[PDB]
Amino acid sequence: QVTLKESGPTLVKPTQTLTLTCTFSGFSLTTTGEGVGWIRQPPGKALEFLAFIYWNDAKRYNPSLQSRLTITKDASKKQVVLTLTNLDPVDTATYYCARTSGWDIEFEYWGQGTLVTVSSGSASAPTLFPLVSCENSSPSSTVAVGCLAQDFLPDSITFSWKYKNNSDISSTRGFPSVLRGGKYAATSQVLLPSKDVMQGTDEHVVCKVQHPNGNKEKDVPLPVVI
Amino acid sequence: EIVLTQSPGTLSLSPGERATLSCRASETVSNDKVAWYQQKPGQAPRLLIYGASSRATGIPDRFSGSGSGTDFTLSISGLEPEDFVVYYCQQYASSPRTFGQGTKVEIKRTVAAPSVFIFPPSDEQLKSGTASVVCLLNNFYPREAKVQWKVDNALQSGNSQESVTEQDSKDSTYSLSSTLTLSKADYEKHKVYACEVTHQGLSSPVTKSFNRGEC
Ligand SMILES: *[C@@H]1O[C@H](CO)[C@@H](O[C@@H]2O[C@H](CO)[C@@H](O)[C@H](O)[C@H]2NC(C)=O)[C@H](O)[C@H]1NC(C)=O
């Protein structure tokens, strides 16, 4: 089996320089037709090709990003390097490298990507706020409460909801994050049966998130129904 | 500069049906050096077809490529569970290599109207100078929903984000959160907050709202 692995800074400020490296294993930049290239994917959008370098060291670029792009191979270390200057937030994206094994077989082998966030802000952990259903005029079915993990970076949180009787909850309601002024926000909600909340002492449930910069965990107050 | 237009952007079929995704080039593609990739959200693309019609190493046979000139087709008969992902065509006739925007194949299900809830900003966050009103839409289908914010009857704009989950694994439904974010100052200057949601499964638009403080 062939293999590629990318790596680089997971966070970087604009007006700067990104360097990524595709360490590959299973082939050498020597056969004809063979080549390797970098392709990125901005969150939620399409794949976009940056640069490609052939064995025989022939390099090819994406006009729109050329003169800002630079591609190089080191047969010595089995690792291709990409350089992007003048970083901008729009350059945030997952960066993949892949190998074309011949002339017709295009990118038959892909690395695995590495998300490179481009924010001037600094790696801050989440700050939590409870979301209590200001529900009524029909409580109905069941009651819902949330939790708003705010101002974090890089985008990388998880949610787990636990009870007072410290068990676990069935939320599944996790929304992808939205990028607001250099910082990412996310919401998580959870439905509990109207029958339970309109009873028990549980004056709350707790919201738990694990971001790599801190593992905060606020508690959200149920509403009291009956 | 060979532009690639894929359509439809999103296609809604049932498991087992046949799917025909089209990819059209802005000019003829020399030698038909066109390729198709499949990507599940999260993972990396995987090659499905190259040279317009040649299958790849370890890629099933319901996947087939055809066409030439400026029209190409990736057809997959007998849609299987795992086939409901995104698909991209690419041309490598020149390089600049270029990609299409991708067409997503989703699971057709019946209409499910959403259940909606509105959450007022918490005092805590309020002390922080910024208040965030949220409106959650739960388990609905199809994906299209109009979610409008109104403050003291004023239609809002450029001050709400919007996030939507991927099609539910057990439900085939979607949920979405719409966030209205405004200055604590502005927030305390108004009385009634309302998010109106429009969806094919509601006979009439449902509006949810609360009055600052009375919650
Ligand atoms: C935590 O509190 C809830 C009530 O708010 C408990 O729910 C009830 O107890 C059983 C025991 O597990 C639950 O399975 C049911 O949902 C509820 N019972 C009834 C009458 O249906 C919940 O169980 C508590 N967590 C623990 C420690 O089990």
Side-chain angles (χ1 to χ4, degrees), chain A residues 2-226, chain B:
Chain A
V2 163
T3 118
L4 292 86
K5 177 56 181 175
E6 300 84 5
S7 45
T10 72
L11 207 178
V12 308
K13 292 61 189 310
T15 342
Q16 219 220 63
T17 300
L18 176 272
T19 309
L20 308 174
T21 70
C22 186
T23 296
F24 68 87
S25 158
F27 55 93
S28 60
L29 53 314
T30 59
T31 141
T32 67
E34 175 183 291
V36 172
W38 287 89
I39 300 84
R40 67 190 180 165
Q41 186 181 50
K45 305 204 199 62
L47 296 170
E48 167 183 33
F49 163 89
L50 292 340
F52 184 89
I53 195 174
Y54 277 91
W55 84 102
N56 80 256
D57 217 67
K59 52 73 194 66
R60 256 49 177 163
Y61 297 111
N62 168 341
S64 184
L65 294 190
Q66 188 163 177
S67 69
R68 195 153 84 74
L69 274 179
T70 42
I71 220 290
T72 55
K73 65 167 180 173
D74 201 81
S76 256
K77 299 186 298 310
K78 303 255 152 289
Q79 66 175 50
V80 67
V81 165
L82 188 296
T83 301
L84 206 203
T85 177
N86 293 62
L87 286 175
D88 197 327
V90 273
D91 288 336
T92 315
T94 301
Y95 291 74
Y96 301 85
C97 55
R99 182 233 183 193
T100 68
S101 52
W103 281 104
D104 298 349
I105 283 214
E106 272 293 278
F107 311 121
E108 181 176 38
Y109 303 102
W110 288 67
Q112 209 51 209
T114 178
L115 203 192
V116 162
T117 298
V118 168
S119 70
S120 71
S122 177
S124 59
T127 110
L128 312 181
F129 301 110
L131 284 183
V132 58
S133 211
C134 156
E135 173 75 76
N136 234 298
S137 185
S138 189
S140 295
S141 29
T142 54
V143 58
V145 56
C147 182
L148 192 226
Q150 192 135 65
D151 279 358
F152 60 89
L153 197 313
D155 187 62
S156 26
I157 312 186
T158 298
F159 283 92
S160 40
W161 291 76
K162 286 194 162 298
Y163 283 94
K164 194 188 187 173
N165 58 63
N166 190 65
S167 300
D168 293 78
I169 316 181
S170 302
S171 72
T172 306
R173 289 308 126 64
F175 304 72
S177 304
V178 31
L179 159 36
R180 192 122 49 208
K183 296 285 192 60
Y184 296 1
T187 302
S188 176
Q189 84 155 77
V190 46
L191 283 351
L192 318 178
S194 275
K195 218 298 143 290
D196 292 1
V197 163
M198 59 172 266
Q199 214 85 209
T201 208
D202 312 290
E203 109 263 346
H204 74 175
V205 282
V206 298
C207 172
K208 311 181 65 174
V209 305
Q210 39 259 273
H211 169 67
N213 273 182
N215 277 35
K216 337 302 267 295
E217 80 158 60
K218 186 139 293 182
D219 56 353
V220 307
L222 285 336
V224 326
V225 190
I226 317 190
Chain B
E1 170 68 320
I2 297 176
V3 190
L4 260 30
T5 279
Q6 281 181 259
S7 60
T10 148
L11 189 76
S12 312
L13 283 334
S14 278
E17 299 196 355
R18 209 238 277 204
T20 54
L21 318 197
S22 102
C23 173
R24 150 99 65 182
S26 59
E27 61 197 69
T28 160
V29 66
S30 340
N31 304 292
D32 309 331
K33 299 258 209 153
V34 142
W36 291 85
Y37 298 94
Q38 179 198 69
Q39 169 170 42
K40 168 156 186 170
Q43 289 66 94
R46 66 178 292 192
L47 183 67
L48 275 173
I49 289 197
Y50 54 107
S53 56
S54 308
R55 241 185 306 282
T57 328
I59 263 55
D61 67 332
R62 52 278 187 55
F63 293 86
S64 37
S66 63
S68 88
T70 61
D71 269 282
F72 306 74
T73 297
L74 163 66
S75 194
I76 155 169
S77 48
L79 239 21
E80 284 310 310
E82 331 71 57
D83 302 343
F84 290 85
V85 285
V86 178
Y87 292 79
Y88 298 92
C89 57
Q90 180 234 162
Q91 60 79 199
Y92 48 101
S94 186
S95 192
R97 294 175 144 68
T98 54
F99 287 79
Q101 289 294 90
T103 115
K104 177 200 202 64
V105 297
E106 85 161 354
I107 300 154
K108 207 194 170 178
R109 141 168 211 335
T110 64
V111 179
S115 62
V116 5
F117 302 97
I118 181 167
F119 300 86
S122 52
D123 273 332
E124 320 200 17
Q125 168 180 41
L126 286 157
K127 272 148 65 186
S128 303
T130 58
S132 283
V133 201
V134 331
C135 171
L136 298 197
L137 279 56
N138 285 312
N139 318 111
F140 63 79
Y141 186 94
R143 211 281 205 54
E144 319 299 313
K146 241 307 159 187
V147 188
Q148 286 194 294
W149 287 103
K150 266 164 289 186
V151 73
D152 276 343
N153 286 316
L155 212 185
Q156 297 316 100
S157 44
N159 50 170
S160 49
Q161 43 54 299
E162 208 153 79
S163 180
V164 24
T165 77
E166 285 295 284
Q167 193 160 211
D168 190 298
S169 50
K170 275 284 189 181
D171 225 345
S172 295
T173 51
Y174 292 95
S175 294
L176 107 34
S177 64
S178 166
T179 288
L180 181 76
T181 137
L182 64 182
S183 167
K184 172 188 172 181
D186 310 353
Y187 178 79
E188 291 190 303
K189 297 161 66 176
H190 303 105
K191 180 87 173 189
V192 12
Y193 290 75
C195 60
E196 198 186 21
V197 41
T198 285
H199 186 86
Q200 170 180 167
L202 267 30
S203 55
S204 44
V206 180
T207 100
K208 282 275 187 156
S209 52
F210 70 84
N211 303 300
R212 199 189 57 214
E214 313 179 11
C215 240

